[PDB]
PDB file of C-alpha atoms and ligand atoms in Angstrom:
ATOM      1  CA  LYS S  68     -21.622 -40.113  41.286  1.00  0.00           C
ATOM      2  CA  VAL S  69     -20.895 -43.832  40.967  1.00  0.00           C
ATOM      3  CA  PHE S  70     -19.626 -44.487  37.453  1.00  0.00           C
ATOM      4  CA  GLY S  71     -20.102 -47.503  35.313  1.00  0.00           C
ATOM      5  CA  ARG S  72     -16.945 -49.206  34.103  1.00  0.00           C
ATOM      6  CA  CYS S  73     -17.304 -48.215  30.446  1.00  0.00           C
ATOM      7  CA  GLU S  74     -18.745 -44.789  31.283  1.00  0.00           C
ATOM      8  CA  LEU S  75     -15.601 -43.975  33.284  1.00  0.00           C
ATOM      9  CA  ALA S  76     -13.292 -45.382  30.621  1.00  0.00           C
ATOM     10  CA  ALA S  77     -14.921 -43.074  28.069  1.00  0.00           C
ATOM     11  CA  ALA S  78     -14.653 -40.044  30.365  1.00  0.00           C
ATOM     12  CA  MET S  79     -11.009 -40.765  31.123  1.00  0.00           C
ATOM     13  CA  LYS S  80     -10.243 -41.196  27.415  1.00  0.00           C
ATOM     14  CA  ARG S  81     -11.820 -37.838  26.570  1.00  0.00           C
ATOM     15  CA  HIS S  82      -9.705 -36.212  29.306  1.00  0.00           C
ATOM     16  CA  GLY S  83      -6.422 -37.503  27.767  1.00  0.00           C
ATOM     17  CA  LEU S  84      -5.486 -40.356  30.122  1.00  0.00           C
ATOM     18  CA  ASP S  85      -5.230 -43.193  27.542  1.00  0.00           C
ATOM     19  CA  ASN S  86      -1.485 -43.923  27.301  1.00  0.00           C
ATOM     20  CA  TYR S  87      -0.676 -40.802  29.397  1.00  0.00           C
ATOM     21  CA  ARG S  88       2.991 -41.256  30.357  1.00  0.00           C
ATOM     22  CA  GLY S  89       2.682 -44.707  28.783  1.00  0.00           C
ATOM     23  CA  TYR S  90      -0.137 -46.051  31.002  1.00  0.00           C
ATOM     24  CA  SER S  91      -2.925 -47.588  28.932  1.00  0.00           C
ATOM     25  CA  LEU S  92      -6.538 -46.805  29.777  1.00  0.00           C
ATOM     26  CA  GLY S  93      -7.118 -50.114  31.564  1.00  0.00           C
ATOM     27  CA  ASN S  94      -4.547 -49.166  34.210  1.00  0.00           C
ATOM     28  CA  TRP S  95      -6.485 -46.024  35.149  1.00  0.00           C
ATOM     29  CA  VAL S  96      -9.841 -47.869  35.256  1.00  0.00           C
ATOM     30  CA  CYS S  97      -8.364 -50.665  37.383  1.00  0.00           C
ATOM     31  CA  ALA S  98      -6.864 -48.105  39.787  1.00  0.00           C
ATOM     32  CA  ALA S  99     -10.192 -46.286  40.136  1.00  0.00           C
ATOM     33  CA  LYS S 100     -12.048 -49.548  40.829  1.00  0.00           C
ATOM     34  CA  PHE S 101      -9.867 -50.537  43.739  1.00  0.00           C
ATOM     35  CA  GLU S 102      -9.233 -47.041  45.108  1.00  0.00           C
ATOM     36  CA  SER S 103     -12.857 -45.848  45.195  1.00  0.00           C
ATOM     37  CA  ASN S 104     -15.165 -48.500  43.670  1.00  0.00           C
ATOM     38  CA  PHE S 105     -15.845 -45.853  40.953  1.00  0.00           C
ATOM     39  CA  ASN S 106     -17.413 -43.447  43.519  1.00  0.00           C
ATOM     40  CA  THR S 107     -16.399 -39.806  43.159  1.00  0.00           C
ATOM     41  CA  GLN S 108     -17.493 -39.091  46.748  1.00  0.00           C
ATOM     42  CA  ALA S 109     -15.119 -41.606  48.420  1.00  0.00           C
ATOM     43  CA  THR S 110     -12.985 -40.344  51.333  1.00  0.00           C
ATOM     44  CA  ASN S 111     -10.657 -42.232  53.639  1.00  0.00           C
ATOM     45  CA  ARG S 112      -8.565 -40.989  56.566  1.00  0.00           C
ATOM     46  CA  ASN S 113      -4.917 -42.023  56.943  1.00  0.00           C
ATOM     47  CA  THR S 114      -2.972 -42.765  60.121  1.00  0.00           C
ATOM     48  CA  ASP S 115      -0.848 -39.620  59.736  1.00  0.00           C
ATOM     49  CA  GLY S 116      -3.951 -37.399  59.761  1.00  0.00           C
ATOM     50  CA  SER S 117      -4.128 -36.766  56.025  1.00  0.00           C
ATOM     51  CA  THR S 118      -7.183 -37.792  53.994  1.00  0.00           C
ATOM     52  CA  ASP S 119      -7.601 -39.325  50.516  1.00  0.00           C
ATOM     53  CA  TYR S 120     -10.273 -37.843  48.193  1.00  0.00           C
ATOM     54  CA  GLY S 121     -12.270 -38.914  45.178  1.00  0.00           C
ATOM     55  CA  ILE S 122     -12.231 -41.491  42.452  1.00  0.00           C
ATOM     56  CA  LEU S 123      -8.406 -41.734  42.529  1.00  0.00           C
ATOM     57  CA  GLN S 124      -7.974 -41.176  46.311  1.00  0.00           C
ATOM     58  CA  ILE S 125      -5.641 -38.174  46.067  1.00  0.00           C
ATOM     59  CA  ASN S 126      -3.950 -37.356  49.393  1.00  0.00           C
ATOM     60  CA  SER S 127      -4.106 -34.053  51.293  1.00  0.00           C
ATOM     61  CA  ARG S 128      -0.551 -34.246  52.624  1.00  0.00           C
ATOM     62  CA  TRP S 129       0.864 -33.430  49.174  1.00  0.00           C
ATOM     63  CA  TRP S 130      -1.730 -32.623  46.540  1.00  0.00           C
ATOM     64  CA  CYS S 131      -4.759 -30.651  47.773  1.00  0.00           C
ATOM     65  CA  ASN S 132      -5.822 -28.441  50.673  1.00  0.00           C
ATOM     66  CA  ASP S 133      -8.505 -29.600  53.131  1.00  0.00           C
ATOM     67  CA  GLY S 134      -7.808 -27.097  55.905  1.00  0.00           C
ATOM     68  CA  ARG S 135      -6.941 -29.807  58.443  1.00  0.00           C
ATOM     69  CA  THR S 136      -3.612 -31.415  57.357  1.00  0.00           C
ATOM     70  CA  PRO S 137      -0.887 -29.321  59.018  1.00  0.00           C
ATOM     71  CA  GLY S 138       2.301 -28.845  57.046  1.00  0.00           C
ATOM     72  CA  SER S 139       0.693 -30.024  53.810  1.00  0.00           C
ATOM     73  CA  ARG S 140       1.521 -28.905  50.325  1.00  0.00           C
ATOM     74  CA  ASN S 141      -1.236 -28.156  47.845  1.00  0.00           C
ATOM     75  CA  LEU S 142       0.740 -29.177  44.777  1.00  0.00           C
ATOM     76  CA  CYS S 143      -2.387 -29.373  42.547  1.00  0.00           C
ATOM     77  CA  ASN S 144      -3.538 -25.958  43.872  1.00  0.00           C
ATOM     78  CA  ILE S 145      -7.110 -27.054  44.581  1.00  0.00           C
ATOM     79  CA  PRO S 146      -9.378 -27.628  47.577  1.00  0.00           C
ATOM     80  CA  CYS S 147      -9.725 -31.347  48.189  1.00  0.00           C
ATOM     81  CA  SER S 148     -13.522 -31.031  47.931  1.00  0.00           C
ATOM     82  CA  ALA S 149     -13.157 -30.243  44.226  1.00  0.00           C
ATOM     83  CA  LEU S 150     -11.951 -33.841  43.817  1.00  0.00           C
ATOM     84  CA  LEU S 151     -15.366 -35.231  44.866  1.00  0.00           C
ATOM     85  CA  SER S 152     -17.339 -33.683  41.995  1.00  0.00           C
ATOM     86  CA  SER S 153     -19.335 -35.710  39.475  1.00  0.00           C
ATOM     87  CA  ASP S 154     -17.096 -33.932  36.916  1.00  0.00           C
ATOM     88  CA  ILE S 155     -13.732 -35.760  37.004  1.00  0.00           C
ATOM     89  CA  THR S 156     -11.732 -32.955  35.367  1.00  0.00           C
ATOM     90  CA  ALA S 157     -10.000 -31.796  38.551  1.00  0.00           C
ATOM     91  CA  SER S 158      -9.116 -35.355  39.607  1.00  0.00           C
ATOM     92  CA  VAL S 159      -7.710 -36.151  36.168  1.00  0.00           C
ATOM     93  CA  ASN S 160      -5.641 -32.957  35.925  1.00  0.00           C
ATOM     94  CA  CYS S 161      -4.126 -33.610  39.363  1.00  0.00           C
ATOM     95  CA  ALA S 162      -3.471 -37.304  38.604  1.00  0.00           C
ATOM     96  CA  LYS S 163      -1.481 -36.208  35.551  1.00  0.00           C
ATOM     97  CA  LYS S 164       0.797 -34.204  37.870  1.00  0.00           C
ATOM     98  CA  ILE S 165       1.152 -37.135  40.284  1.00  0.00           C
ATOM     99  CA  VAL S 166       2.011 -39.744  37.638  1.00  0.00           C
ATOM    100  CA  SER S 167       4.661 -37.398  36.207  1.00  0.00           C
ATOM    101  CA  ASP S 168       6.552 -36.899  39.496  1.00  0.00           C
ATOM    102  CA  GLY S 169       8.984 -39.797  39.038  1.00  0.00           C
ATOM    103  CA  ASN S 170       7.298 -42.944  40.422  1.00  0.00           C
ATOM    104  CA  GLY S 171       4.659 -43.428  37.764  1.00  0.00           C
ATOM    105  CA  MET S 172       1.516 -45.191  38.907  1.00  0.00           C
ATOM    106  CA  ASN S 173       3.291 -46.785  41.868  1.00  0.00           C
ATOM    107  CA  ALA S 174       2.082 -43.687  43.766  1.00  0.00           C
ATOM    108  CA  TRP S 175      -1.292 -45.527  44.017  1.00  0.00           C
ATOM    109  CA  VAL S 176      -0.839 -48.422  46.426  1.00  0.00           C
ATOM    110  CA  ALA S 177      -3.899 -50.270  45.119  1.00  0.00           C
ATOM    111  CA  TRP S 178      -2.579 -50.073  41.556  1.00  0.00           C
ATOM    112  CA  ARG S 179       0.759 -51.571  42.608  1.00  0.00           C
ATOM    113  CA  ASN S 180      -0.862 -54.336  44.614  1.00  0.00           C
ATOM    114  CA  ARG S 181      -3.921 -55.234  42.503  1.00  0.00           C
ATOM    115  CA  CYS S 182      -3.417 -53.972  38.925  1.00  0.00           C
ATOM    116  CA  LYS S 183       0.308 -53.922  38.116  1.00  0.00           C
ATOM    117  CA  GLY S 184       1.314 -57.050  36.229  1.00  0.00           C
ATOM    118  CA  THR S 185      -2.271 -58.194  35.557  1.00  0.00           C
ATOM    119  CA  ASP S 186      -4.346 -58.195  32.370  1.00  0.00           C
ATOM    120  CA  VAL S 187      -5.584 -54.610  32.739  1.00  0.00           C
ATOM    121  CA  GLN S 188      -7.043 -54.536  29.232  1.00  0.00           C
ATOM    122  CA  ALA S 189      -9.900 -56.603  30.652  1.00  0.00           C
ATOM    123  CA  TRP S 190     -11.131 -53.465  32.424  1.00  0.00           C
ATOM    124  CA  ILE S 191     -12.073 -51.857  29.092  1.00  0.00           C
ATOM    125  CA  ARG S 192     -13.129 -55.013  27.225  1.00  0.00           C
ATOM    126  CA  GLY S 193     -16.536 -54.634  25.613  1.00  0.00           C
ATOM    127  CA  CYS S 194     -16.680 -50.835  25.920  1.00  0.00           C
ATOM    128  CA  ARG S 195     -17.495 -48.636  22.943  1.00  0.00           C
ATOM    129  CA  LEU S 196     -14.453 -46.347  22.804  1.00  0.00           C
TER     130      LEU S 196
HETATM  131 CL1   CL C 191      -5.661 -51.125  28.499  1.00  0.00          CL
HETATM  132 CL1   CL C 192      -3.590 -52.648  48.368  1.00  0.00          CL
HETATM  133 NA1   NA C 193     -20.967 -48.100  31.772  1.00  0.00          NA
HETATM  134 NA1   NA C 194      -2.522 -30.184  51.802  1.00  0.00          NA
END
C-alpha cells in the first residue's frame, strides 16, 4: 500500500507515535516519506548483505529475521516480511523499540539528513487529526 500523507499521519497517531519518546508526529511522517516514499512494500539491500524493509526501512541485521542475514539478531521478534503489510502495526511496534534504544531517531539516516532541524510540522499541516 502507498499511503497518502494525511492518511499515514492518522494511522501513526492511532498507533501511539505522536510525541512517542518526545518525537512529534511530523518527524515520523517526514522519516517515512524519505525512507520509503510512503510505500509499505519498499525493500533495499545494504552493502553488508542486510536488507531494509517497509515504510520505515527497518534493517535485518538487528531487528527482524529474513533468513539470509547471517549473524543477525531479531530484536523485534518478527519475520521481516511482516513489515511490508498494508497494516503498519508491526512496523510501528518495532520502531518504538528502535527509537528507545539510546540514539532516538538518529537511527534513521534519512531522518538525520533530511528531517532533523527542519519544519517537520509542515508534514501534517492541513490534515484532520
Ligand atoms: Cl509535528
Ligand atoms: Cl540521507
Ligand atoms: Na491522505
Ligand atoms: Na536478523
